[PDB]
RNA sequence: CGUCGUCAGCUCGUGCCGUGAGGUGUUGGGUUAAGUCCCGCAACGAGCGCAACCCCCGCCGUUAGUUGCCAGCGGUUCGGCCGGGCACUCUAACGGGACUGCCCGCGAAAGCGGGAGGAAGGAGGGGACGACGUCUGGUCAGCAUGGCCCUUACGGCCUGGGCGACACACGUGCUACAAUGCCCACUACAAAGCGAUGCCACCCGGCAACGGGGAGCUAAUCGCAAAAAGGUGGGCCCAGUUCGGAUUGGGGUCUGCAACCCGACCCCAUGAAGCCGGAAUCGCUAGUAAUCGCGGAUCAGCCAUGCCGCGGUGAAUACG
């Protein structure tokens, strides 16, 4: 029961910062604070280090995990 | 009621029979202030007595009430020790309230699925001298008298 | 309500969403009636004097 | 902590607002803040004058501002080279180019706000709080009046333990919505703390 | 009852509209 | 025919500001539509009496906007004289739509 | 010819016009049994007429706005009785003992603050 | 500001009593919602509080009428629509009305019981209003403020995270366990509010949320708007059910720079516990309780079932 409408949001910080790496090759991590941005196709393969408010955690983007956001892989809290 | 002796509310007469005793019974049936649904229920139950029975409903109604009226009841009281259920006569006013209440209470315990069906059958059984209503009434009088030993505590 | 926050007034919010009312008389950020721009507390005080015209004490 | 402002409580009857101008759900709040900005300087400046009150009317960029005082002369200035600098402040804030009257007060001993200011003053000069009050009530009660009362807050005399000093004469019926009782507060600042001062004056009933 | 979104009352109580409660 | 709604916070600041347009027109124009009331738009304000907690008190504040009508029958000329700048209200608003 | 009496109740006014004739009651146009479609109540609103043996003497045109049908019903009770007294003042001496003349003052108590409903006070834990 | 507590009290001046702290008055009898009033009295009066003066609701009258109405006539695309009219409703401003005034009874008086007249009767109903003081009450995080304390930082900017964590425990609520019920269709009665870069009629697209288009409204003359319970007809047939909607899968709309953490909403699917709740415990005395819906503040949107308020239907019981 998700939602957006029309314009699958992604933050330009990396959108371009990543589509450029494509123009060349793979890059050793890509740390960012835009856990908002939607994971789009041209990422599968890269390893984005998503922050969580304290840590810059590495995430290997796979096909199956496209439509999702970044934060969904960089969990915020720590539990018992 | 610490200051005055609360005067009994005076309710209008039954739209139909013009009997105040009936309006009362209706109010008791009523729940969530739906006097209509109430009034309705009662009346349909009055018709189910026209058929299944002979006499006019009012007669049965009156009789039904008159049978559920407990002329004695036990009321608890604290006296150096524990709670001694003391038997005492039941006033005219309370005699009625308890009757009408018990009718609806016994009535709604019945299995018939329709409200009106339940009231009518209870009034009938009541007027006959049977039914959960009359039961309780007897159950009370059983409690009373059966505790006459404490009767000398009056009120 | 430290001056450093009464800085908000500054137009440049970056995004129209980040803007908030704040009492114009005390800086109060919560319960800040629009019609007066005042906070619930301030409203009460001035109203009591007479600085709020037409504004009276409702009863019914 | 009980009892409401004797003024806010009488605004309907015996007591009118300090701002009597209309507006609408787009203006009011502005013309509002304005008055606050107004009295802002007025009370910061005309203190020595005897700032007993600052009324503010309107019509359309026009503003009454009938600032009342005990010593009008202190408002005017050298011949009038002040009530010229004050009218100056008017547009300095809001370029409405409005009036700015001045009205002496008929006996500043019936002007609760003052009566309280007086007491607040005395307290800062390290006066005897109780006497100051005994006296004040006297003056106020002396120059007419049907009743009066004064109340200084806590840390009286510099005390480590706050208290609340009294004094009151005649009638000062507050529950009677129709007494017409002037009320005035004064925040007497100090070296060891703050001291609230309140004054009430009962004059004429019906 | 007032808690079933997919009902007349469900829409009312939940202050809304849709299939189960259209604006006429 | 002269629509002229009056809106003040006082039911005399208008009832005066309208009592002018009442006779200062009768003395130069038709009997006029007389002054008409119109429901008042009330605005209440409910604040928690004291600061910090104690959410069970509040005390109520209302800012009621009264309304007036009038309507001078016949857009006269001599009526517009004594009704040109002989006003007296301070806290009123008057829209003219004859 | 015609006779009038207002009649109000629980915040609902009713216009009552009694004109000699049968008894056709036109509340908001519609027939009595039309506007009061199955409400054991209604009937009562005509009790003022029966109170004076009339009913079959006047036809009645009635208007009503405000409140609820039961309120409106009561209002009528007043109207029909009010107009009926105007028509004939000797009728007051008969409607008073039954009190159809009185205006039921019972209204809705204001919703007080702190409470849930004027009086219904919020419950509290182990006090 | 809360609270004892809207409780019926707390005092003062002078006189009088006592070495004195203090006492009297304020105690007493009668009466009242009340230190309310009456009678008595070494006290006589006064102040703060009670009451009244203010607001709302009941009835009536005047002034005004684009609200209303064939009341009454004419025309009617038969909509109070056009003309017309202030009658009625109403809108809102002023004024009347109730005083135990009157009648019987008891009484020393106050006042109590009862009666008529009257819309209303003995404080007619509901508000605002809360004494000297108490709790070292609550709040320096609204604001003000003495003192102390940090001043490359206990200050400032930002992005992100948190305030939304959960094995658990309690409070206040919401929805419900159903037939006096649930569902669909059709149809009828309200009050109080809100609306410009806002309320949005109406048209079309979409099951829809919503979208595109676009009339009117500075709003007693336009919109939010459907009031719901109710009435009428039909469905269900006692079952965890056509009761109940938790949870979860999926699709999508809208606000917003952005809805992973953490928005509401629509549609399909899923359809949980729950069969009326142990000990114990809460509210309410009349249009109150119960029950049904409507608006508003804050607010982009919203986690509101909360809060403040409005009207519909409308009880039971009080010996004591
Ligand atoms: Mg600060
Ligand atoms: Mg915001
Ligand atoms: Mg804010
Ligand atoms: Mg609160
Ligand atoms: Mg209600
Ligand atoms: Mg009292
Ligand atoms: Mg003495
Ligand atoms: Mg002695
Ligand atoms: Mg002596
Ligand atoms: Mg003494
Ligand atoms: Mg004592
Ligand atoms: Mg004594
Ligand atoms: Mg007494
Ligand atoms: Mg007294
Ligand atoms: Mg009249
Ligand atoms: Mg007497
Ligand atoms: Mg009072
Ligand atoms: Mg403490
Ligand atoms: Mg400090
Ligand atoms: Mg929290
Ligand atoms: Mg269902
Ligand atoms: Mg369509
Ligand atoms: Mg109109
Ligand atoms: Mg059926
Ligand atoms: Mg199942
Ligand atoms: Mg089911
Ligand atoms: Mg079952
Ligand atoms: Mg909102
Ligand atoms: Mg949520
Ligand atoms: Mg709501
Ligand atoms: Zn403030």
Q: Which chain G positions have a beta carbon within 8 Å of F46's beta carbon? A: 113
DSSP-assigned letters across all residues of chain C: --GGGTTTTSS--SSGGG-----TTT---SS--TTTS--HHHHHHHHHHT-SSS-EE---
**Which residue shows structure tokens 């219904």?**
G120
CB neighbours of A37 closer than 8 A, spacing ≥ 6? A9, A10, A11, A13, A14, A15, A69, A70
Please give the structure tokens belonging to residue D90.
């008017």
Domain boundaries, chain B: 1-155
**Angular region, G60: left φ>0, alpha ψ -120 to 50, beta rest:** beta
Q: What is the C-alpha to C-alpha distance for residues B72 and D94, in angstroms, rounded to an integer?
A: 86
Q: Residue D59 and residue F50: Cβ atoms within 8 Å?
A: no
Q: Which CATH code of 3.60.110.10, 3.30.300.20, 3.40.50.150, 3.40.190.10 fits the domain covering D16-106? A: 3.30.300.20
Nearest one of B104, B83, B101 to B93, comparing CA atoms: B101
Nearest one of A46, A22, A49, A47 to A33, comparing CA atoms: A49
CB neighbours of B86 closer than 8 A, spacing ≥ 6? B74, B75, B76, B77, B147, B150, B151, B153, B154, B155
Q: Which of C30, C32, C39, C40 to mutate to test the interface with F (most CBs of F within 10 A)?
A: C40
Q: What is the C-alpha to C-alpha distance for residues D63 and F56, in angstroms, rounded to an integer?
A: 40
Q: Which CATH code of 3.40.50.300, 3.30.70.600, 2.40.30.170, 3.40.30.10 fits the domain covering F1-98? A: 3.30.70.600
Instruction: State how beta strands B82-83 and B78-79 pair.
Output: antiparallel
Length of chain D: 206
**Which residue shows structure tokens 């205006």?**
G103
The SS3 of residue D182 is strand
Q: What is the C-alpha to C-alpha distance for residues G103 and G77, in angstroms, rounded to an integer?
A: 10
C1 annotated ligand binder: no
DSSP alpha helix (H) spans, chain E: 8-13
CA B133-B138-B144 angle, 5° bins: 135
Sequence ranges of chain D with CATH classification 3.30.1140.32: 107-206
DSSP-assigned letters across all residues of chain F: --EEEE--SSTTHHHHHHHHHHHHHHTTSS----------B--EEE--SSSSS-TT---EEE--B--EEE--SS--SSHHHHTSS----SS--B--B-
Name the phi and psi angles at G26, rounded to 5.
-105, 80
Cα G33 to Cα A46, B21, G27, G30, G50: the distances in Å are: 79, 27, 9, 8, 17
Q: What is the C-alpha to C-alpha distance for residues A62 and D169, in angstroms, rounded to an integer?
A: 87
DSSP-assigned letters across all residues of chain B: --SS--PPP-PPPPTTT--HHHHHHHHHH--SS-HHHHHHHHHHHHHHHHHHSSS-HHHHHHHHHHHH--S-EEE--EETTEE--EEE---HHHHHHHHHHHHHHHHTTSS-SSHHHHHHHHHHHHHHT-SHHHHHHHHHHHHTTTTGGGGGG--
Domains defined along chain C, listed by start: 1-60 (4.10.830.10)
**Angular region, A21: left φ>0, alpha ψ -120 to 50, beta rest:** alpha
Contact present, D154 and D129 (Cβ < 8 Å): no
Domain boundaries, chain F: 1-98
User: Which long-range contacts (C-beta less than 8 Å, at least 24 apart) are formed by G24-32?
Assistant: G24/G59, G24/G60, G25/G59, G25/G60, G25/G61, G25/G62, G26/G60, G26/G61, G26/G62, G27/G62, G27/G63, G27/G64, G27/G72, G27/G76, G28/G62, G28/G63, G28/G64
Q: What is the C-alpha to C-alpha distance for residues C58 and E24, in angstroms, rounded to an integer?
A: 39
Please give the structure tokens belonging to residue G3.
């006779």
Q: Which fold has domain B1-155?
A: Ribosomal Protein S7 (1.10.455)
Contact present, B49 and B124 (Cβ < 8 Å): yes
Eight-state DSSP code of residue G32: H
Please give the structure tokens belonging to residue G63.
């208007």
**Which residue shows structure tokens 């009636």?**
C33
Q: Which chain F positions have a beta carbon within 8 Å of D64's beta carbon? A: 90
* CATH code of the domain covering residue A39: 3.30.860.10
The SS3 of residue D52 is coil
Instruction: State how beta strands A30-32 and A47-51 pair.
Output: parallel
By what method was this entry solved? X-ray
* CATH code of the domain covering residue G50: 3.30.230.10
Q: Which nucleotide is nearest to F40 (CA to C1')?
A: H92
Report the number of distinct structural domains present in chain G.
Answer: 1
The parent domain of residue G109 ranges over 1-127
Q: Residue B40 and residue G44: Cβ atoms within 8 Å?
A: no
Contact present, F1 and F71 (Cβ < 8 Å): yes
* Packing angle of the helix pair B57-68, B20-29 (nearest 10 deg): 70
Cα(D14) to centroid of ligand 17, in Å? 17
Q: Which chain G positions have a beta carbon within 8 Å of B36's beta carbon? A: 39-41
Eight-state DSSP code of residue G10: S
Give the distance, in angstroms, between residue A21 CA and nucleotide H309 C1': 62
Contact present, A52 and A69 (Cβ < 8 Å): no
Residue B40 sits at the chain G interface (C-beta within 8 Å):
yes
Cα(C20) to centroid of ligand 2, in Å? 6
**Angular region, D173: left φ>0, alpha ψ -120 to 50, beta rest:** beta
Query: Which nucleotides of strand H lie within 7 A of protein CB?
Result: 1-6, 33, 46-60, 63-66, 69-72, 88-94, 116-120, 124-133, 137-139, 141-147, 155-157, 159-163, 165-167, 170-177, 179-185, 188-197, 207-210, 218-220, 225-232, 237-238, 243-246, 249-261, 263-268, 271, 281-295, 297-300, 305, 307-320
CB neighbours of D181 closer than 8 A, spacing ≥ 6? D6, D10, D147, D172, D174, D200, D201, D202, D203
Cα(B39) to centroid of ligand 9, in Å? 80
Q: What is the C-alpha to C-alpha distance for residues A47 and A51, in angstroms, rounded to an integer?
A: 13
Give the distance, in angstroms, between residue B29 CA and nucleotide H238 C1': 22
CB neighbours of F83 closer than 8 A, spacing ≥ 6? F20, F21, F24, F25, F28
Q: Which residues make beta-bridge pairs with A59?
A: A48
Cα(A59) to centroid of ligand 27, in Å? 53
C26 annotated ligand binder: yes
Instruction: State how beta strands B82-83 and D103-104 pair.
Output: unpaired
Name the phi and psi angles at B26, rounded to 5.
-65, -45
Q: Which fold has domain D107-206?
A: Ribosomal protein S3 C-terminal domain (3.30.1140)
Name the phi and psi angles at D42, rounded to 5.
-45, -45
Q: What is the C-alpha to C-alpha distance for residues B5 and B76, in angstroms, rounded to an integer?
A: 22
State the virtual CA torsion across D21, F66, F58, D3 in degrees, nearest 10: 70
The parent domain of residue A36 ranges over 1-80
């Amino acid at each position: 029961p998700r939602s957006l409408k029309k314009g699958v949001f992604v933050d330009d910080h990396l959108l371009e910062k990543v589509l450029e790496l494509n123009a060349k090759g793979e890059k050793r991590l890509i740390k960012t604070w835009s856990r908002r941005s939607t994971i789009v196709p041209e990422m599968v393969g890269h390893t984005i280090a998503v922050y969580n408010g304290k840590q810059h955690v590495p995430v290997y983007i796979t096909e199956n995990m496209v439509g999702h956001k970044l934060g969904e892989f960089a969990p915020t809290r720590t539990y018992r | 009621a610490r200051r005055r002796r609360a005067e009994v509310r005076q309710l209008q007469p039954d739209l139909v029979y013009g009997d105040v005793l009936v309006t009362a019974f209706i109010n008791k049936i009523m729940r969530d202030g739906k006097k209509n649904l109430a009034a309705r229920i009662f009346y349909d139950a009055c018709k189910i007595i026209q058929e299944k029975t002979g006499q006019e409903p009012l007669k049965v109604f009156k009789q039904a009430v008159e049978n559920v009226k407990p002329r004695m009841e036990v009321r608890s009281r604290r006296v150096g020790g524990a709670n001694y259920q003391v038997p005492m006569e039941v006033s005219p006013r309370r005699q009625q309230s308890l009757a009408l209440r018990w009718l609806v209470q016994a009535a709604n315990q019945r299995p018939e699925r329709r409200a009106a069906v339940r009231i009518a059958h209870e009034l009938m059984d009541a007027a006959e001298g049977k039914g959960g209503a009359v039961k309780k009434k007897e159950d009370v009088e059983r409690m009373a008298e059966a505790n006459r030993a404490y009767a000398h505590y009056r009120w | 309500a430290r001056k450093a926050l009464i800085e908000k007034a500054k137009r440049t919010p970056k995004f129209k969403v980040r803007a908030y009312t704040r009492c114009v008389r005390c800086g109060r950020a919560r319960s800040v009636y629009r019609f007066f721009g005042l906070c619930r507390i301030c409203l009460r005080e001035l109203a009591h004097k007479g600085q709020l015209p037409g504004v009276r004490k409702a009863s019914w | 902590g009980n009892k409401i402002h004797p003024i806010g409580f009488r605004l309907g009857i015996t007591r009118d607002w300090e701002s009597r101008w209309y507006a609408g759900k787009k203006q009011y709040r502005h013309l509002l803040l304005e008055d606050q900005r107004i009295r802002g300087l007025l009370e910061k400046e005309l203190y020595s004058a005897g700032l007993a009150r600052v009324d503010i009317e309107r019509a359309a960029d026009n503003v009454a501002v009938t600032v009342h005082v005990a010593k009008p002369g202190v408002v005017i200035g050298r011949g009038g080279e002040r009530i010229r600098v004050l009218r100056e402040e008017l547009a300095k804030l809001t370029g409405k180019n409005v009036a700015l009257n001045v009205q002496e007060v008929q006996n500043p001993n019936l002007s609760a706000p003052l009566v309280a200011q007086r007491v607040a003053e005395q307290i800062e000069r390290r006066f005897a709080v109780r006497r100051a009050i005994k006296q004040a009530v006297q003056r106020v009660m002396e120059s007419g009046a049907k009743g009066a009362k004064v109340i200084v807050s806590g840390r009286i005399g510099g005390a480590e333990q706050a208290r609340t000093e009294w004094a009151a004469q005649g009638r000062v019926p507050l529950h009677t919505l129709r007494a017409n009782i002037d009320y005035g507060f004064a925040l007497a600042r100090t070296t060891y703390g703050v001291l609230g001062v309140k004054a009430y004056i009962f004059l004429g009933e019906v | 009852g007032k808690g079933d979104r997919r009902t007349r009352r469900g829409k009312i109580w939940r202050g809304t509209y849709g299939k189960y409660r259209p604006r006429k | 025919k002269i629509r002229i709604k009056l809106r003040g916070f006082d039911h005399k600041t208008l009832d005066a500001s309208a009592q002018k347009i009442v006779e200062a027109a009768r003395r130069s124009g038709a009997q006029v539509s007389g002054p008409i009331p119109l429901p008042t738009r009330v605005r209440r304000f409910t604040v928690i009496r004291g600061p910090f907690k104690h959410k069970d008190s509040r005390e109520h504040f209302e800012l009621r906007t009264h309304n007036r009508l009038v309507d001078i029958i016949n857009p006269n000329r001599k009526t517009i004289e004594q009704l040109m700048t002989l006003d007296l209200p301070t806290g009123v608003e008057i829209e003219i739509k004859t | 010819e015609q006779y009038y009496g207002t009649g109000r109740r629980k915040e609902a006014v009713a216009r009552v016009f009694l004109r000699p004739g049968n008894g056709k009651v036109t509340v908001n146009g519609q027939d009595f049994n039309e506007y009061f479609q199955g409400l054991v109540r209604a009937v009562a609103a005509l009790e003022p007429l029966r109170a004076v043996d009339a009913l079959g003497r006047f036809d009645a045109y009635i208007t009503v706005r405000g409140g609820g049908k039961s309120g409106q019903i009561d209002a009528i009770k007043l109207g029909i009785a009010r107009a009926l007294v105007q028509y004939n003042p000797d009728y007051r001496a008969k409607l008073k003992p039954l009190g159809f003349l009185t205006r039921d003052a019972r209204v809705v108590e204001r919703k007080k603050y702190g409470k849930h409903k004027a009086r219904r006070a919020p419950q509290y834990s182990k006090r």
